[PDB]
């Protein structure tokens, strides 16, 4: 479970992310589509070429959802309600894929945050991403 130390670590790092939320989200998606090609099976309607404005736009939306999660780190289930249902009953993304995006989000963060990506912040962030994914796959069945 996210402890107070976890919550402050995530808040501080995301605070550093700041206005780069969108671009980091787009970068994470490109790293995911490249490193784990199977995740592409969920975006057959996307222009997935290098530099795609469609991937960029989506990256911003995924970024905004996470900023919102951080802002409601105390009650994520009620803040991520609509999205959980979306993924559970409309998108139906196999749960295994959330681990892949989370890994790619961590790598992107590590590549951009040299000062704040300490072992402890790394632990908090990983825990946070697992919780977000838990909230998003909570209504699958």
């Amino acid at each position: 479970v996210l402890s107070p130390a976890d919550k402050t670590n995530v808040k501080a790092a995301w605070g550093k992310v700041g206005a780069h939320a969108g671009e980091y989200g787009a970068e994470a998606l490109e790293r995911m589509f490249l490193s784990f090609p199977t995740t592409k099976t969920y975006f057959p309607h996307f222009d997935l070429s290098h530099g795609s404005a469609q991937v960029k736009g989506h990256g911003k939306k995924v970024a905004d959802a996470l900023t919102n999660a951080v802002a409601h780190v105390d009650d994520m289930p009620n803040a991520l309600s609509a999205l959980s249902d979306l993924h559970a009953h409309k998108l139906r993304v196999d749960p295994v894929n959330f681990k892949l995006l989370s890994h790619c989000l961590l790598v992107t963060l590590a590549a951009h945050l040299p000062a704040e990506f300490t072992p402890a912040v790394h632990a908090s962030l990983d825990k946070f991403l697992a919780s977000v994914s838990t909230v998003l796959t909570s209504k699958y069945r």
Partner: protein, 146 residues
């Protein structure tokens, strides 16, 4: 793939008593019921809202027969699973867009179905032989993904 002659004789002997029609519908039906998100590919099948709807659905039974029929074809060519499933692998990726994870879920459901149908015949060592087969088939179907 990597099966000891004893394991190969095992898988073979048991499969010869399998009616792919019955077990096919059973396996695909249970997949859709136990792991509901797998229904994302079968909206055209109609009502899959309840276990009874899924199990009695004609298209579900039909697709089950086909899938298990292809699986059965893989068992006749255990020396070349990748070669045998090459076409199907490209097809599931490029045309159907099926996340390979699904093949793994179906493999596990099938093992449960063989256990349920055969009872004591499905011994722990026979199951281990089938776990390798099911994993090998899933890997052969996921090999052309890109």
């Amino acid at each position: 793939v990597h099966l000891t002659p004893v394991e190969k004789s095992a898988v073979t002997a048991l499969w010869g008593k399998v009616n792919v029609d019955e077990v096919g519908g059973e396996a695909l039906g249970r997949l859709l019921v136990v792991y509901p998100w797998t229904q994302r590919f079968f909206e055209s099948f109609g009502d899959l809202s309840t276990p009874d709807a899924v199990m009695g659905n004609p298209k579900v039974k039909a697709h089950g027969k086909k899938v298990l029929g292809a699986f059965s074809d893989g068992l006749a060519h255990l020396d070349n699973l990748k070669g045998t499933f090459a076409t199907l692998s490209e097809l599931h990726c490029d045309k159907l867009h099926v996340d390979p994870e699904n093949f793994r879920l179906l493999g596990n459901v099938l093992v449960c179905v063989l256990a349920h149908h055969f009872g004591k015949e499905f011994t722990p060592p026979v199951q281990a032989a089938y776990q390798k087969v099911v994993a090998g088939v899933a890997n052969a179907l996921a090999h052309k993904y890109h």
